[PDB]
Amino acid sequence: MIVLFVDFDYFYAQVEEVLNPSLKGKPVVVCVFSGRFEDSGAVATANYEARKFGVKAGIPIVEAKKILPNAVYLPMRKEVYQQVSSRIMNLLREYSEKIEIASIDEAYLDISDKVRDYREAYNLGLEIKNKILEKEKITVTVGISKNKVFAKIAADMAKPNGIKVIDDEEVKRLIRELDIADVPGIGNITAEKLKKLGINKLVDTLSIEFDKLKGMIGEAKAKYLISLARDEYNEPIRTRVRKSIGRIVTMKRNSRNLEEIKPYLFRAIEESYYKLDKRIPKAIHVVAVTEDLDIVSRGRTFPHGISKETAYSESVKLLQKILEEDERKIRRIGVRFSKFI
DNA sequence: GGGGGAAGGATTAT
DNA sequence: TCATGAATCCTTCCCCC
Ligand SMILES: *[C@H]1c2c(cc3ccc4cccc5ccc2c3c45)[C@@H](O)[C@H](O)[C@@H]1O
Ligand SMILES: [Ca+2]
Ligand SMILES: [Ca+2]
Numbered sequence: 001m002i003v004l005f006v007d008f009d010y011f012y013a014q015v016e017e018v019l020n021p022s023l024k025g026k027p028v029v030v031c032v033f034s035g036r037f038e039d040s041g042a043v044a045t046a047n048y049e050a051r052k053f054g055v056k057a058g059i060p061i062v063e064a065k066k067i068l069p070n071a072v073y074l075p076m077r078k079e080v081y082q083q084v085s086s087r088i089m090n091l092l093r094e095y096s097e098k099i100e101i102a103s104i105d106e107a108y109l110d111i112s113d114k115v116r117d118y119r120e121a122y123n124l125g126l127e128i129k130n131k132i133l134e135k136e137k138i139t140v141t142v143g144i145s146k147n148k149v150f151a152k153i154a155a156d157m158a159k160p161n162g163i164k165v166i167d168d169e170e171v172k173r174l175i176r177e178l179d180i181a182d183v184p185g186i187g188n189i190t191a192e193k194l195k196k197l198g199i200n201k202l203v204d205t206l207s208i209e210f211d212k213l214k215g216m217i218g219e220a221k222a223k224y225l226i227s228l229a230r231d232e233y234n235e236p237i238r239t240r241v242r243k244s245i246g247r248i249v250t251m252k253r254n255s256r257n258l259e260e261i262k263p264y265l266f267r268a269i270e271e272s273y274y275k276l277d278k279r280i281p282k283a284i285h286v287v288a289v290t291e292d293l294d295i296v297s298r299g300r301t302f303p304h305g306i307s308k309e310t311a312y313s314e315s316v317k318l319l320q321k322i323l324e325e326d327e328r329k330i331r332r333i334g335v336r337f338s339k340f341i
Numbered sequence: 342g343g344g345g346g347a348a349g350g351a352t353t354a355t
Numbered sequence: 356t357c358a359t360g361a362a363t364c365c366t367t368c369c370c371c372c
Contacts, residue, residue: 036356036357060356187367219365293356296349296350297348
């Protein structure tokens with residue numbers, strides 16, 4: 001299997017630069033403003049001019065403005081980015097029908113039937129890079145390797161505006177030298193738990209016994225790291241289907257008074273049904289973000305599709321179950337739909 | 342025992 | 356005084372043959 005992974009560089013920030021080229025060279029910070037208070041929310045992404053100074057995805061906008069008060073802070077325009085993304089994804093389908101769109105700015109292409117060796121692949125990668133740049137003015141990073149994971153790692157090493165191949169030999173070196181924390185799917189919590197087990201590189205997962213790994217990081221993650229260490233990972237590039245869709249809204253003030261919360265929830269449902277866009281869910285979950293920012297949720301699965309009306313009444317019952325089983329105040333209240341017909 | 346699948350907290354990446 | 360203008364992951368837990 002020969003895999004070509006495309007990762008659009010600082011995508012939201014880049015798209016804003018394309019739509020307003022005068023931003024190029026300036027620190028650009030794309031944020032999600034929550035509404036709770038002045039500059040409350042989080043940074044969705046920052047271009048490298050802003051990243052240099054520590055402004056990166058996930059940090060509070062207030063924290064970012066204390067570092068770069070003069071940087072350009074733009075509200076996230078998801079719809080715009082999604083459309084530019086769709087167009088780029090379409091360009092990618094012209095190089096391979098076997099495409100897995102992992103997210104709005106990442107895609108895996110199984111180009112096995114299209115290229116013979118890694119030299120080909122690389123040339124295709126440069127062709128893909130140039131095409132996107134020409135058609136959309138977006139620079140991407142291409143990662144090429146034997147499976148989806150190393151192609152992603154390849155891209156992680158080559159970004160931004162890069163292209164890296166990791167041949168069957170460098171894979172073996174990485175299985176020994178790469179910080180296991182740099183492996184896709186292993187976030188801060190699993191990394192730290194692996195550290196306490198004594199595992200720091202992929203090869204180490206082989207020295208530990210399975211039941212110990214399984215107990216610490218979980219069966220799924222355990223088999224995954226082991227398969228990677230054994231150089232046996234070969235998951236197929238497949239079409240990804242969004243499994244759940246939701247809407248979470250911030251309330252004007254923290255509450256646990258059902259009638260104060262209701263409007264927000266109902267609006268969340270009303271807007272969720274629009275994003276469902278034809279999809280009919282058989283499951284619904286009411287999500288409550290408490291005052292200490294913890295998450296509590298309650299859901300129910302139906303033997304049939306859920307109508308907006310059924311959603312309205314069931315959500316209230318579910319929200320009551322939250323307020324009943326959890327005593328904290330609700331900051332944000334949302335709904336989530338899944339198990340589509 | 343384990344297929345199946347529901348529930349919901351845990352985790353990842355932005 | 357945090358959001359993904361969340362979504363998925365994935366571990367229980369339970370029914371039931
Ligand atoms: C934000 C997002 C998306 C889809 C929709 C669809 C319909 C909406 C109606 C009203 C409000 C609203 C807010 C955010 C939305 C909406 C709506 C997604 O396509 C996007 O990825 C974000 O989740
Ligand atoms: Ca990216
Ligand atoms: Ca990404």
